[model samples]
Target chain A: EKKPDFTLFLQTLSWEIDDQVGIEVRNELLREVGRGMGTRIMPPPCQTVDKLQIELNALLALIGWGTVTLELLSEDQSLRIVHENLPQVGSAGEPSGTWLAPVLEGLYGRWVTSQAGAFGDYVVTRDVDAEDLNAVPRQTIIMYMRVRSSATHHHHHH
Target chain B: EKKPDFTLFLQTLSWEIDDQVGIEVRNELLREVGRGMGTRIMPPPCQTVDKLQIELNALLALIGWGTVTLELLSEDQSLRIVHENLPQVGSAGEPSGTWLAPVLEGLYGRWVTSQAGAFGDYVVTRDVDAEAVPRQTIIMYMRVRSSA
Candidate 1:
């Protein structure tokens, strides 16, 4: 049967939200949506924490991005993700791909870590280390998955 | 520091395209876009064709559709796809869902199979077996990816 035109609809949602609430708040909301999706979509067999990340990456590849890579930084408690050929990136005047940051945050912080008796204090930082906003190769999102004793951890909580 | 708002811009394009070419033709065009994307984005291990399908599925899931499954029904020469949690289906009356069919067509039919030394004769067909337009549980897209 016919599927809803998500390519356009989701894009519309992103744009409308960005315009209405601005980038910061729009991203904050999307992260929550992504977290809910992670909780529902990411499956069981809760063995290793890395498996969750693996599953997430697999899922990411399915939905049509370019060259998805996620690396877990243990000491820093963050995940360095390189998403190439993202539709949002490479466009002339798009923001630094902030729309996807919170979505990933929700997925990792709320669902991925929640399996291992903990939830992350996740914060997504841009690749300030290299490249300017307009002419970059890929969409680099550095996610901070902080460890915590309790479930009620905020972004800077741990 | 500042990124263009792709979400809105893409939507605007979709809406404008729909207005211009009508839904049927617009979707056909998108499939070509998908095919081009498949060619460019899909990496080159030069491996089996099944890996291409697998890689395509992975890309689909990342784009936020729920439980996206694509299978090659070779006996019938069709690619059967099951997509859940697609936004357009649940809404009241929207004809935009048909837009992505061609994208899949391009990705699987032209790009994926061409790599295997066969150009696909791909055609997308919706759920003819059951279900109406609105209250559909799963969005099933059948693509005829054939060599001849």
Candidate 2:
């Protein structure tokens, strides 16, 4: 038996389902995959200081997951990653898809919500300026770590 | 700049397009890609007989494309290959899709149609018994080398 080439398998899957589901469903499905895979793939960090780095590295170990250039804008506030080749097979002139976005969201979102004490929801968005869609495909995304306490929800009688 | 891993790129691309396009369109797209890439990736074969092997070997040289165990079932009638990890990352319980099928179809179909004189339309199908999804993610692809 030989090690299966997961990179290609993942790429093929993403492309296959790219248009099958809408954004809402796509995100949920990918997130589910991410969460499921993350538990098995992600390893616990020895030190809390390098938790984020460790978490990122866990996924990187999988071939073709892409290279992650991470930037911590502020502690527990903002996190940014320049993700190249999430599908690892993206090419110039190829049709665009969002299959990997939700997977990333699910992987890191779980961290933000659980480890980082994020009470509400974190805002994760792909920055247009951060993507490279030619010969070599890449994407730059930012994750805003916001807590529920940070925003006050007001309830009013209709 | 370094050459991006084509094997991974091809596999990923196949999956991405698997659902977006129908079988007809998908096969054409992959064939176009195979033909396009073949011009650059495939080397000149020493003999006409070895052309198919050479073309396939060129693509296989790349990592993650999987290994090819080729067996000429007949002189010009059939070919069988025990492809291990063609995408190099298949497993049991994984979401099922024929993402890689059209790519192979396009790649070899064009070759057979163009180069093989006596051979007819090539028929490629995955062998159910050969693919072990649980323990090993291997695929056994049988190719009918001749038509009429």
Candidate 3:
């Protein structure tokens, strides 16, 4: 069977674009830019400029990045997790099909840097990451370890 | 809906002359009369007498009467249902359309004898005994209250 060409991921983010906020900020980085660019200079070959990067940075600054943690227990105490339930890669209300790739790359790199060496466990080596987990919910575990390790480092060790 | 003709039920219960068992029992009941008539008076208006009462009695006997009770439970704890899973009502299999009606009748009477008053709540006055449960997890209890 042919695999789906487009990968769909849900992200949790939204911003309102109006006369006061302008489209560039609301559509791009997911937050409000204080004012519209009335005197913005046009680029080399363009009639006018929107300054998307500046507005996106402002929005990203508003919504700070952070990690989450999860835990599970069993009555038998012999916790046998054949597969982990991976948290979706993104959130709800994220526009993935449109101009989100560049924004994601920048955000993801910074988020990883924020984790420092604590998230090192989540970054699997080329061999380990490439090989199949044999359906062992390892993706979910990796997400958990990344968030958990990062939090622990921030709380006590940092 | 139009009222069902009461005559229909009577006709269904009444014995047909050509029915195999009906014919056999009718002939047996008239055997004594035939012998009596042969020895006695020669000229009888009813030379071919077919007694039908015996066959009628046999048919009545075949139609065994019974009462069933069905109970529907929202939780397994009520019925002591230990499976901890929903019971899957399987497909009726090949020729299901033809096979199901009789199977339904068989189960209808089965609970009337086997489970007693427990089957009362689930018993349907029309169609098959049925209960509409909201979700997958439910216990249906049936018991035969009385039978003959």
lDDT of 2 by residue, A4-105 (tens): 333343344444444344656655655665554445455443334256665666556453455565565665556565565554333311234434665566
Which sections of candidate 1 miss by over 4 Å? A1-4, A65-74, A77-98, A118-136, A148-158, B1-148
lDDT (10s digit) by residue, model 2, range B77-111? 56665544445222212234444544554445444
**Best model per TM-score:** 2
The CAPRI classification for model 3 reads as: incorrect
Docking class of 1: incorrect
RMSD of 1: 15.0
The CA lDDT at B36 in model 3 is 41
**Pick by TM-score: 1 or 2, better one:** 2
Looking at model 1, residue A66 earns an lDDT score of 37
TM-score of 1: 0.42
Candidates 1 and 3, the one with greater TM-score? 1
Best by lDDT: 1
Give candidate 3's error at residue B101 in angstroms.
Answer: 4.4
lDDT by candidate, in order shown: 0.49, 0.47, 0.27
